[PDB]
């Protein structure tokens, strides 16, 4: 999927951090958020997040739109494992169903509805 976070961090390091943070914060989930390749939108100022497990995917989506300063008129989509996630899922549910072997959840965003 090409996340710069993976390019910058050896797997063993990611897995150790993800396991530790999930044990430490049972009510939060570790999430990497990055702009998809080719997307015509801003990069986020931060890519590594600790997100409340009860926040919904839809709420997190609107928060990300604000953090990249997107006008409400503009398009944006999330991709998790190359799939647009259900907006009513909580971030904890999305994490449980989609975290990688390093215990991080990865979310890409794009102005195009295809990753």
């Amino acid at each position: 999927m090409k996340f710069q976070y993976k390019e910058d961090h050896p797997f063993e390091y990611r897995k150790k951090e993800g396991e530790k943070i999930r044990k430490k914060y049972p009510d939060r989930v570790p999430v990497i958020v990055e702009k998809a390749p080719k997307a015509r939108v801003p990069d986020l100022d931060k890519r590594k997040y600790l997100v409340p497990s009860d926040l919904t995917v839809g709420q997190f989506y609107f928060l990300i739109r604000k953090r990249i300063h997107l006008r409400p008129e503009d398009a944006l989509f999330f991709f998790v494992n190359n799939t647009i996630p259900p907006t009513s899922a909580t971030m904890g549910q999305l994490y449980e169903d989609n975290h990688e072997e390093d215990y991080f959840l990865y979310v890409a965003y794009s102005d195009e509805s295809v990753y």
Binding site: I21, P30, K46, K48, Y49, L50, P52, L55, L63
Partner: peptide, 8 residues
């Protein structure tokens, strides 16, 4: 490497 915390 710090995490950015999202508040509820």
């Amino acid at each position: 490497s710090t995490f950015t915390n999202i508040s509820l």
